Design a protein around this motif. Structure first.
Motif, short mmCIF file in Angstrom:
data_model
loop_
_atom_site.label_atom_id
_atom_site.label_comp_id
_atom_site.label_asym_id
_atom_site.label_seq_id
_atom_site.Cartn_x
_atom_site.Cartn_y
_atom_site.Cartn_z
N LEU A 95 -3.69 14.05 -7.65
CA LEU A 95 -2.34 13.53 -7.62
C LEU A 95 -2.17 12.52 -8.75
O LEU A 95 -3.12 12.23 -9.45
N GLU A 96 -0.92 12.10 -8.97
CA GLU A 96 -0.58 11.10 -9.96
C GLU A 96 -0.98 9.72 -9.42
O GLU A 96 -0.73 9.40 -8.27
N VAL A 97 -1.59 8.91 -10.27
CA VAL A 97 -2.18 7.63 -9.85
C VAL A 97 -1.62 6.51 -10.72
O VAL A 97 -1.55 6.63 -11.93
N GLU A 98 -1.24 5.40 -10.08
CA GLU A 98 -0.77 4.21 -10.78
C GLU A 98 -1.49 3.00 -10.22
O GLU A 98 -1.94 3.02 -9.06
N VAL A 99 -1.54 1.94 -11.02
CA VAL A 99 -2.10 0.68 -10.57
C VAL A 99 -1.02 -0.38 -10.42
O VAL A 99 -0.15 -0.54 -11.25
N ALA A 100 -1.09 -1.11 -9.32
CA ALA A 100 -0.33 -2.34 -9.16
C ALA A 100 -1.35 -3.47 -9.05
O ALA A 100 -2.39 -3.29 -8.40
N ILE A 101 -1.09 -4.56 -9.78
CA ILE A 101 -1.96 -5.72 -9.88
C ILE A 101 -1.62 -6.74 -8.78
O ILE A 101 -0.51 -7.14 -8.62
N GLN A 102 -2.58 -7.06 -7.92
CA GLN A 102 -2.50 -8.25 -7.08
C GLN A 102 -3.30 -9.34 -7.80
O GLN A 102 -4.53 -9.24 -7.90
N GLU A 103 -2.57 -10.34 -8.29
CA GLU A 103 -3.14 -11.43 -9.09
C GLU A 103 -4.17 -12.22 -8.29
O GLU A 103 -5.23 -12.49 -8.82
N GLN A 104 -3.90 -12.51 -7.01
CA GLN A 104 -4.88 -13.19 -6.18
C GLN A 104 -4.92 -12.55 -4.80
O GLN A 104 -3.89 -12.08 -4.34
N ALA A 105 -6.10 -12.59 -4.17
CA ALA A 105 -6.37 -11.88 -2.93
C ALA A 105 -5.70 -12.57 -1.73
O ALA A 105 -6.38 -13.22 -0.94
N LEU A 106 -4.39 -12.38 -1.58
CA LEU A 106 -3.57 -13.09 -0.61
C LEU A 106 -3.38 -12.26 0.67
O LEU A 106 -2.64 -12.65 1.56
N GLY A 107 -4.03 -11.09 0.77
CA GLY A 107 -4.05 -10.39 2.03
C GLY A 107 -3.29 -9.08 1.93
O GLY A 107 -2.78 -8.73 0.88
N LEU A 108 -3.22 -8.38 3.06
CA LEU A 108 -2.87 -6.98 3.10
C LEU A 108 -1.35 -6.80 2.94
O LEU A 108 -0.90 -5.94 2.15
N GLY A 109 -0.58 -7.66 3.63
CA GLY A 109 0.87 -7.67 3.50
C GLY A 109 1.32 -7.93 2.07
O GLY A 109 2.15 -7.19 1.55
N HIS A 110 0.70 -8.92 1.42
CA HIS A 110 0.99 -9.22 0.01
C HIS A 110 0.61 -8.04 -0.90
O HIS A 110 1.37 -7.68 -1.80
N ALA A 111 -0.57 -7.44 -0.69
CA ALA A 111 -0.99 -6.25 -1.44
C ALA A 111 0.05 -5.11 -1.36
O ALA A 111 0.39 -4.50 -2.36
N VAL A 112 0.52 -4.81 -0.14
CA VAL A 112 1.51 -3.76 0.05
C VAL A 112 2.79 -4.14 -0.71
O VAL A 112 3.31 -3.30 -1.43
N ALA A 113 3.23 -5.40 -0.59
CA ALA A 113 4.39 -5.90 -1.33
C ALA A 113 4.22 -5.68 -2.84
O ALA A 113 5.20 -5.36 -3.52
N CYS A 114 2.99 -5.85 -3.38
CA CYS A 114 2.75 -5.70 -4.82
C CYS A 114 3.02 -4.27 -5.31
O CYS A 114 3.28 -4.08 -6.50
N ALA A 115 3.01 -3.27 -4.39
CA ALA A 115 3.29 -1.88 -4.74
C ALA A 115 4.78 -1.56 -4.86
O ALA A 115 5.09 -0.48 -5.34
N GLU A 116 5.68 -2.43 -4.36
CA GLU A 116 7.09 -2.09 -4.24
C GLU A 116 7.67 -1.71 -5.60
O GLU A 116 8.49 -0.78 -5.64
N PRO A 117 7.31 -2.41 -6.72
CA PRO A 117 7.82 -2.04 -8.04
C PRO A 117 7.46 -0.62 -8.47
O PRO A 117 8.14 -0.07 -9.32
N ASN A 118 6.44 0.00 -7.87
CA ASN A 118 6.06 1.35 -8.21
C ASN A 118 6.77 2.43 -7.37
O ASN A 118 6.45 3.60 -7.45
N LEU A 119 7.69 2.05 -6.50
CA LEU A 119 8.38 3.02 -5.67
C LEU A 119 9.67 3.48 -6.34
O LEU A 119 10.25 2.74 -7.14
N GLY A 120 10.12 4.69 -6.00
CA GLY A 120 11.38 5.23 -6.49
C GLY A 120 12.41 5.28 -5.37
O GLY A 120 12.12 4.93 -4.22
#
Ligand SMILES: O=c1ccn([C@@H]2O[C@H](COP(=O)(O)OP(=O)(O)O)[C@@H](O)[C@H]2O)c(=O)[nH]1
Ligand SMILES: O=c1ccn([C@@H]2O[C@H](COP(=O)(O)OP(=O)(O)O)[C@@H](O)[C@H]2O)c(=O)[nH]1
Ligand code: NA
Lengths: 291, 291
Positions: A95-120
């Motif tokens: 499949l197509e793969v992209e990276v979203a950067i979590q600048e600091q390890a602030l937890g799982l909710g924050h990680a998921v939030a970091c992906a929002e810019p990659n959604l259509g």
């Protein structure tokens, strides 16, 4: 129907020091295959077309694994290693793969939030797979997608674990539906004592989240450092009348979070491989008869 | 008396694809510790003061492993994880480590030849440790040094393997000494059929080589594509009257060259580790008795 899956892969893997000083935990092999490939393969089998990998700046090599490697491929072709060539072509073609950067390890909710810019605009719902859990056979997300088709809203995953053994997990407060493996979620308790556990349904690292989760993650009270509790975002959606259900996994599971559980996964898979299984099983047969 | 140990680590681990597309074979963990650290420790325990790792450009990262990690070290200190901090400080503090590049993987003889620019005026003898072998419980190089102190020349290492399981190895043509574990080497046969094997002594990846090996590696006829084999260099020295002895290892050994041999190592170590042993043993008791 989801087309985008999110993999939060931004931890260090302290439990795997000193290896994880130099190697991302998610690239560690289960037999011969990186854990991130096994999780990408599960996501693809459930219909993902895109994978968004959330990682720290220092672990961007996770995604590079999913890029083509023309030189290695050419080298292998030139030596007639057709079996090994197929293995290296598998992850880049999943499949197509992209990276979203979590600048600091602030937890799982924050990680998921970091992906929002990659959604259509087509991403009404997204899958979330935590890479330290393997859920077997593949297809918990398909059972979850059927729940979402019938009830709308968001779907979670659980393991069925006796109350005496569940105190390390988040435990759902549930009521019944017409399907015995599908429960309505009223809430979740973090690490209840046995006597206070609302159920035997322990939260597992698979999710099918309505796009509304992103707005809930922005509305919740952040933590001391900016940690966003995914559990609190789910509780908010519940309070606002969003349908949340859980599917109970009835298959096997493996926990890649510590070396012990990782080694169990690897032995389990190797013993089923006709290249490795027979010789390892015979060795093990003698090894465990002695100190 | 040697102070420099050479570790040829410039192969691709084809047998660990697809993981070795992204991760050097020698950084893969045995339970939680990279293979290369186990080899470094064996070297240091035989008195090495320097490790020369021979690697490809692609695999230089095997270098960073042996460097201090300030920010990681401070993080663990700040969390009070004194035992994990010690884990990551162990490798950088074992001995001095340097790198020599092998541009293209033309064989083991060529790899050793690549470390020659790293030798100083006192490197009359060097150790060579192949990173795919573990020699347990306490290595073998100290025993090999004693042989070199008695006889001069160079020293090799063998495992004692029955003739009907030996055909995958180089096998020594030997005669006896005073010591039942030390043999005089007259030659080596590549991959003999069982009925032709000149002994049960299979060549193992430990060497204590007189500096004269670099001249032998310059004088032997290069291969079809420029492959020098250490074998041919040793045979040339033998032909010129250089004394060559072999020490027979009677303890245990692991083969980290394939996924099967690597898991055997991991299970062996974990079963002796109190953090995993009892529970893993029971898990294994059940697991091997089912497909
Ligand atoms: O994408 C992710 C995945 C995890 N984490 C956090 O990082 C830690 C997870 O560490 P890991 O799962 O690698 O295990 P460890 O061995 O470090 O305990 C926890 O604090 C998680 O909340 C994070 O910030 N982003
Ligand atoms: O420093 C080294 C180590 C090995 N090799 C060669 O590379 C191959 C072995 O590669 P590796 O040990 O990684 O095993 P693989 O998994 O590729 O079989 C053999 O021809 C070795 O002689 C090399 O050129 N340089
Ligand atoms: Na260590």
């Amino acid at each position: 129907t989801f087309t985008t899956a999110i993999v939060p892969a931004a931890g260090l893997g302290t439990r795997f020091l000193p290896t994880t000083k130099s190697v991302p935990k998610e690239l560690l092999p289960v037999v011969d295959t990186p854990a991130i490939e096994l999780v990408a393969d599960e996501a693809r089998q459930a219909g993902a077309e895109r994978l968004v990998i959330v990682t720290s700046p220092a672990k961007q090599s996770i995604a590079a694994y999913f890029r083509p490697a023309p030189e290695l491929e050419r080298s292998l072709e030139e030596k007639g290693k057709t079996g090994q060539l197929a293995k290296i072509r598998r992850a880049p073609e999943l499949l197509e793969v992209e990276v979203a950067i979590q600048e600091q390890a602030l937890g799982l909710g924050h990680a998921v939030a970091c992906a929002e810019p990659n959604l259509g605009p087509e991403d009404d719902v997204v899958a979330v797979l935590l890479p330290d859990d393997l859920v077997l056979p593949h297809g918990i997300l398909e059972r979850m997608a059927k729940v979402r088709a019938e009830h709308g809203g968001s779907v979670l995953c659980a393991f069925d674990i006796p109350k005496e053994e569940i105190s390390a997990y988040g435990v759902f407060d549930v009521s019944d539906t017409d399907d015995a493996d599908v429960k309505r979620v009223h809430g979740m308790v973090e690490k209840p004592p046995a006597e206070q556990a609302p159920s035997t349904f322990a939260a597992a690292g698979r999710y099918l989240l309505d796009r509304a989760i992103f707005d809930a993650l922005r509305r919740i009270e952040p933590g001391a450092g900016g940690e966003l509790q995914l559990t609190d975002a789910v509780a908010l959606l519940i309070q606002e009348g969003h349908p949340v259900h859980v599917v109970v996994h009835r298959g096997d599971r493996h926990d890649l979070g510590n070396p012990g559980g990782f080694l169990r996964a690897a032995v389990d898979f190797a013993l089923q491989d006709p290249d490795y299984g027979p010789e390892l099983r015979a060795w093990l047969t003698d090894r465990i008869a002695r100190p």
